[PDB]
Amino acid sequence: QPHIGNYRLLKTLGKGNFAKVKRARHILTGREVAIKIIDKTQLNPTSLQKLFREVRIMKILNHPNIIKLFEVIETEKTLYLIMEYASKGEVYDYLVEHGRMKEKEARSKFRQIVSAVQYCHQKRIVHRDLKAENLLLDADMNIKIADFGFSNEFTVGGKLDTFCGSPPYAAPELFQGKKYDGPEVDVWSLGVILYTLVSGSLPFDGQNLKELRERVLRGKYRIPFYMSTDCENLLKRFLVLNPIKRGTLEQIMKDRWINAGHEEDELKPFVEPELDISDQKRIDIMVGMGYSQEEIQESLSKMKYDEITATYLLLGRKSSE
Ligand SMILES: O=C1COc2ccc(-c3cnc4ccccn34)nc2N1C[C@H]1CCCCCN1
């Protein structure tokens, strides 16, 4: 069975553009991972430098509902990004199989989604292509957002991608030729996401791009009879045609619907904790693998994304049968 570094490569999860993503297993710890594989020989110098800038963004996104990077392996021809594996797959497929979520379930996921996106907006990182296909689910049904920081050509793509993203989630200012790079475009996409979680369907659709474009620009969508008033009111804060009249995520975190059942636990911007790099239990395990204590401290304190960092972080995740 093919390997790369400390990883046994397993089945392909997806493939498209310049990327493939495979399930794999870290041999030293037994932990499952996902590996994004990019054939560098397909890239020109400009696109190669763009890819490396986007990897450097991935390196600093550390949120429980954002797919985490564990290791970078680079050969002359190929870049490998070893990432968290979300074992329950795409929200897209989950909604197709099971239908709409009850509002209690949708709220749990949406609090995670909003926290993850607001955290990246703090660092002035805009996703620009949030969609059901890159909202993933871990073994406990927690959200893990994929491809935050990456341009479309370095993702395997979703089914309907056109103009570098999924058209049903594209903000109206993109169809009018307007600026397309600030947090407001993600806020629109989040409104489309909330609607799809609670209804099982998209608010704006069409048989072709021209029809969908006109539906998005008109901004009108159906409110299902079963949707609560508070959910409808929350959607009104995302799905606003004029971008500067949209809520910011920090304001939306105070919304009644998003905090229902969380009256003593109001949603607030994520505060990243400092990484404990001194866990002697894991350090002793790694010494047993032949790593030295001094090289563990060097790799973790400089956050190198080498085989030592990956092993330490993976030992901090629960195993799975
Ligand atoms: O296309 C499929 C088919 O179904 C899947 C099932 C599981 C995973 C998966 C699990 N854990 C991770 C970590 C990173 C990336 C993907 N995954 N992916 C997939 N995708 C890839 C996924 C990547 C984001 C861009 C749009 C397409 N979705």
Ligand SMILES: [Cl-]
């Ligand atoms: Cl295996």
